[model samples]
Target chain A: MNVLVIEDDKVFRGLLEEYLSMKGIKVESAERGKEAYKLLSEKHFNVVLLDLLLPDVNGLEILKWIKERSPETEVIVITGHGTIKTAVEAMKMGAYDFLTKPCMLEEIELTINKAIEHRKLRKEN
Target chain B: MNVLVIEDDKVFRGLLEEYLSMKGIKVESAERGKEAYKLLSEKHFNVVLLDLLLPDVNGLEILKWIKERSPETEVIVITGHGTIKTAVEAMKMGAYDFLTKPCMLEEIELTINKAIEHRKLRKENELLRREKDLKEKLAA
Candidate 1:
């Protein structure tokens, strides 16, 4: 699936980008939500693997923008396990799923697969 | 949750049959995949609690039947404790997650509840996407 990973940490962002690319998914990422927002408005992605905490913009803000601008694209929130409550709120606000940080690559892979499956199911319906 | 329990063992079937009924969940059982297949085609189930060892037909065969016939029903693999390896294999073959059998009732309930919650969330995602797709189409 085509994914945009939006994380504020450079190492995590690069690691996810590198990892997802290895999984054969077309991936683009930004360490800031603003840059991610710009890329999002300009081009379409199948899913957004977003982190809630950010330097300039809240990931939820980016999620809202994506929902308003590109409703078909799904958002999968990333968060520390402690902020799980907010992650649940993200789902109610239109996120497909929330991945807890320090999660396994297998977990990420499964979540991505499920996100793509949701889109596929939606299209079929 | 409404479930179909297909197992060859009498005690396992009877215990969960009574237990789930005690919990006020609709429960049904069959000793073979053939019987289970018939039940599934005619009934509604939120999830399928399945095992590998079957008396007559294959367990995965029942899994295959339910998957296409009732695409909404999630298959929960019945694996033994420490069969984490088997769990991964089952997942690859379309099992939602593994539930080790000869285990605690509480753990089983928790696993089932968690899976159904995920079922709801996946549904929510699809609805969100569908509505957005319509909104976009109408706007254009």
Candidate 2:
């Protein structure tokens, strides 16, 4: 499976990359949001891990771009505290799952696998 | 994943359909060659499970049609014991793999997954090649 991890925080993004790669999911990352738009346009990815707040681009705007261009690819939104409302909005916009900040790596891994399983269900029909 | 199983023999085709579907792979079937072709034109599939001895059309002809119209989709040929030579011909015509008759369901599932993976690698390689050529062109 291939994944794109998008987040502006370099430390957290690197951690996500390091952890997910160890688990055998091929991962590419972008710290800036539009880089994601460009990469998504050029490559095929099975899933995307997205952070809600970014340095420049509107987080929700990037989510919108992903849905419009690659609806088959599932998105999991990572949110900061008190952003549950926005995370719910992201789900309404097609994000498969949401993670509140300070979540565990194990939680992320489970969510990723669950999102893929959910995708399998959708594709089967 | 979605697959098309083209087999005129009712029993085998029905069994194949049941197994693939139960394994979570979506499936469609055609009892004759033209039906497979018609279904191909109307829908999308990741791979095709095709029997060599069809009642109506040469299996190679359908392979060629599939390659011409949908090169990305992989075609797995199902063959009888004495038809190894024809199976090789089908391969040259772009059939992804040929399974000799009397193979088990496990073998077919394995071959189908391998073909899909091979197709994915082929597509990824094509994209990288294009990207490389474009980068070189800009420097020249």
Candidate 3:
């Protein structure tokens, strides 16, 4: 599956890319929101792993942008500081799921798989 | 749809019952977990509106029980002092959804409808699997 990892942290980004690649998933990494948006516009991806805090723009704004551009693209919000308010807001804004940062690779893979499955099921229906 | 509301507060319970009844839902109210369990054992309900704060037992315990006994039933948790920890825990424990207290009637109705639709979809999927197994057996 094609996955986009939108995160500003270089070490974490490389870790995720390597991990996902090991799983035979084609991963595209971006260090900023604008770069992520550019990549999104250029190619089709199965899911996007978005960081809540971005250098160029807020994560939620990017989420809204993605929803507007391609509603079918599943986006999972990843945050280091996920509070109840942010979690609720993310859900309300149509996030497929939310996960805290420093999550295990297994947990991340499971969430990504679920998001992809949800997209496929919705498309089938 | 039949709904079981397990809330300890009498006023909120009455309000929920009346509101759901007004919408033509068969609403059953219980102020305690034991009573709710008894009612559940006696009859089947499409959805359960569960309160997290109960006098007798912690709501998560009841949620676990319901999930074990009635995997097909959908339970929506209602919390007045909900935190991210509790919400995440509830979701992991197989709660269908969580709604805060004082939620609008419209929101409640929409959530209930969605839960019912999900249940129906699961039922259809089970039936399809059974039919497929039967077809495979016949061919064999």
Candidate 4:
């Protein structure tokens, strides 16, 4: 499935793209929220892996935009400064899930799969 | 399968018991952690729906006890004041899932089913590993 990776860090984004590519997922990368928004407007993705800390715009702002623009697209927040408060806020804002930085690849895969499955099931219902 | 609802509120507890019973799941209700622990010691349940706000004891403490005593028992935390911090903490503490109060019955049912399925798969994997170990020992 198509997945958007909105992370500013070039090295981590490259690593993520490689990992997800090996998993047979189409991975698209954006360096900032503006770039991510541009790509988001241009195409459709099954899931978006959003970094909470962004260079140009706050990740929460992007999250709000996605919720408004594409309600069907599932967004999973990934943050290095992950706190319980922010995680709750993300969920309240309709985020599918939140993951701390240095998360396991397997866990990320499982959560992504679950998010996609949830999206499909939600549509079916 | 049999399911336990550990909630302190009388009205919500009754509602959950009735709702789960209507779904054909045998339901057990407890008002406090001590009573819930008693019932847990007496019988085997497929899943436990635990409320975070309890009158007698802290929900997380009960959760830890449940995990310690019956690691196979899948526990789903239900909270009215569920914070993101508490949700993550519960997950790290081995909770199956966290659901907020006033959640749709459909959502509750779906989550419970997923938890049961996860527990079943884990148990099956454990049994297979144990059998493989036994066979290896016999061969050695």
Candidate 5:
């Protein structure tokens, strides 16, 4: 599976990147919105792990950007505790789901797996 | 759109039934799992609002039953405060999504709308595959 991790925090980004790679997924990451947008335009990612609070741009805007361009690319928003409502808003904006910060690795894997399955259905035709 | 509400709590079930109907959705309801199974067998609902704490049977079991019979029908679980893990399990078992209790009507509506869209996509894909197979057979 191809996944784009758009997290700004270096440690957490590295954690996710390493974990996903260990599971045999192709992983690419960006530390902020602009880099993420550039990468998004360059290649097709099957799933995107988007951080809502990026230093460069509002995560919701990035969510819209990705959705407007590739609705089939399932976007999973990662949010802090205080931004639960924003996560819900992201869902309305076409995010497949949201994972609150400090989520379990297993949970992330499961959500990614489910998102991929949903994407397959979205592309079944 | 047609929806089946399989919640046992009368007040909540009635609220969902009334709200969905007011929005022009045809809603059927069950107070327990057995009745739900019977209704499910009788009709094709586009979505199901499932509650996990039915008096007669475990809610996850009913989820499996529905998925086993109608893979195309999307199930949205309504879970209580402390059963979050179980709700995740339901998702893994093929539920479209889960809403916590005391959720806003707007959220419920949004989730249902998304679920309906997903169901339509699934149906469209299946129909297309079936059409392709039929055409190939005719050509042969």
Candidate 6:
């Protein structure tokens, strides 16, 4: 499955790309929110790892855009802190789930797999 | 749709029962895990609001038993403290989702509806798969 990692932190982005790549999943990285928009317009991804604290644009706005563009695509918001407030807001706004930064690789993969399953079930229905 | 709320706290349980009941949904409450088990065995519920910190039983074990007995029932874990660790564990064990305590009634309703939708889609797919299997057997 293809995944877009929309994160500004260079090192964290690299780690995600490498880890998912090793799992035989296609990985695309966007250092800026604008770059994410550009990539998203080009093709659809099965899942997205969105950083709510983007430098250029509001993360929630991007989330709304993605849902409008491709409602089937699952967007998992990544927050710097494990704050339930923003995460719940994101979920209310149609985010598949949220991951706190500095998460274990296992946690990331599990959430991604669940999101993929959810998207599949949605499309099949 | 029927929902079972397995929470020990009286006020929270009453609030949930009232809110969901007012929403025109059938609500059942169990103050202990054993009551939950008995109710679950008596009838299958569409969704369950499970409190991980129960007095009589370990919440995770109850979650495991529910999944084993009724794979289609969606269990939403309710944690008193917003501890990501136990919530994640519950999700990993096949929970539909987790809600932190002091949640808005809106959030609870939204999550419950989503879980219901998910269950419907899953059951539909299961039926379709069964039909496909029978067709293939006949063709063979």
Listed per model in order, the count of residue pairs whose N, CA or C atoms clash below 3 Å is 0, 0, 0, 0, 0, 0
Q: Write the per-residue lDDT of candidate 2 for residues A60-105, one digit (tens) a residue.
A: 8888888998898988877673242354356547777767778899
- Please write out the lDDT profile of model 2 over residues B41-120, one tens digit for every residue: 99989899988888889888888999988999999888663232354346546766777778799989999999999999
- Model 4 chain A is weakest, by summed lDDT over 10 consecutive residues, at A83-92
In model 1, pairs of residues that clash are: none
| Residue A7 in model 1: lDDT | 83
Give a tens-digit lDDT track for model 6, residues B1-140.
89999999999999999999988899999999899989999999989999888888988888999998898999888877656445555665678887887788889999999999988999999998887887666777
lDDT of 1 at B64: 69
TM-score of 1: 0.52
TM-score for each candidate, following the candidate numbering: 0.52, 0.51, 0.65, 0.57, 0.63, 0.62
lDDT of 6: 0.85
Rank candidates, TM-score, best first: 3, 5, 6, 4, 1, 2
What TM-score quantifies how close candidate 5 is to the native fold?
0.63
Model 5 lDDT per residue over A1-125, tens place: 69999999989899999999989999998998889999999999999999888888988899899999988888988767424335435665787776777798899988999898888875675
**Candidate that scores best on TM-score:** 3
The collision pairs in model 6 are none
- Fnat per candidate, as a fraction, reads 0.00, 0.00, 0.16, 0.24, 0.00, 0.04
Task: Say which prediction, candidate 1 or candidate 5, comes out ahead on TM-score.
Answer: 5
Q: What is the TM-score of chain A alone in each candidate?
A: 0.92, 0.94, 0.95, 0.96, 0.94, 0.94
Query: Candidate 3's residue-wise lDDT over B1-140, tens digit each?
Result: 89999998999889989999988999999999999989989998889999999999989998998888988899988889787767766776777788887788778888888888888998998998888888666776
Off by over 4 Å in 2: A1-125
- What digit string (tens of lDDT, one per residue) describes model 1 on residues A14-92? 8888899888988998878678988987889998888888888878888888898888898888777324235434654
lDDT of 5 at A114: 89
Off by over 4 Å in 6: A1-5, A10-29, A37-50, A57-78, A85-99, A103-125, B22-26, B106-110, B128-140
RMSD to truth, every model: 8.4, 17.2, 6.5, 12.0, 5.2, 5.9
Pitting candidate 4 against candidate 5, the one with the higher TM-score is: 5
Model 4 / residue A3 / CA error / Å:
23
For model 3, how does the per-residue alpha-carbon lDDT over A36-75 read when each residue is reduced to its tens digit?
Answer: 9899889988898989998888888888888888898889
Chain B TM-score, all predictions listed: 0.88, 0.93, 0.92, 0.90, 0.87, 0.91
lDDT head-to-head 1 vs 4, winner: 4
Q: Report residue B27 deviation for candidate 5 (angstroms).
A: 4.6
